């Protein structure tokens, strides 16, 4: 009934070491945050010649979130958008409503690049600071398999959790994801 509509989908096929653990499918709210969605889709298809295929989840914190998308420095300092090194915070219409919502990592206001996180809790302290733009529709088992990986002293998994393939899946008719107040 009431909520934002999923307009686009992106998939990530994940391998942890050399075991293929499966696919994450993310629904994106293209009507609400069009520029942030177009960026993430383009980086997932690799259509500008660079993007998420071959990048890893570099920061994994149990019961909080998994973070990835740094395809340039692979450690957390880089990444880049299709609009330049950073682009402004589009809006904060969506909140981090619960587990499995997808949001942009940043280094303060208007510094969105390519890094993103998938929540594993309801991080209300982040609302209004990070642009939310998607929700995992399928593959939360894969997200928890990354979560349970032993990490080093900087919360990086000691076995690479790699997006070995990524891309888009078209949505013929947008559908609603119910959210509390809308």
């Amino acid at each position: 009934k009431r909520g934002p509509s999923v307009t686009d989908k992106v998939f990530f096929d994940v391998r942890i070491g050399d075991k293929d653990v499966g696919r994450i499918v993310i629904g994106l709210f293209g009507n609400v945050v069009p520029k942030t969605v177009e960026n993430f889709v383009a980086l997932a298809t690799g259509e500008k010649g660079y993007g998420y295929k071959g990048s890893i989840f570099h920061r994994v914190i149990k019961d909080f979130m998994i973070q990835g998308g740094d395809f340039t420095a692979r450690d957390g300092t880089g990444g880049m958008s299709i609009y330049g090194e950073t682009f402004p915070d589009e809006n904060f219409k969506l909140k981090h409503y619960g587990i499995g919502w997808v949001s942009m990592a940043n280094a303060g206001p208007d510094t969105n690049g390519s890094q993103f996180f998938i929540t594993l809790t309801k991080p209300t302290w982040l609302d209004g600071k990070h642009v939310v733009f998607g929700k995992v529709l399928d593959g939360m088992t894969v997200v928890h398999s990354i979560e349970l990986q032993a990490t080093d002293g900087h919360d990086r998994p000691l076995t690479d959790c790699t997006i070995v393939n990524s891309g888009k899946i078209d949505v013929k008719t947008p559908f609603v994801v119910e959210v509390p107040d809308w």
Partner: peptide, 11 residues
């Protein structure tokens, strides 16, 4: 603590 930053990760 619990933030998601890109460069200087804080507590």
């Amino acid at each position: 603590x619990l933030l998601v930053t890109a460069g200087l990760v804080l507590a």
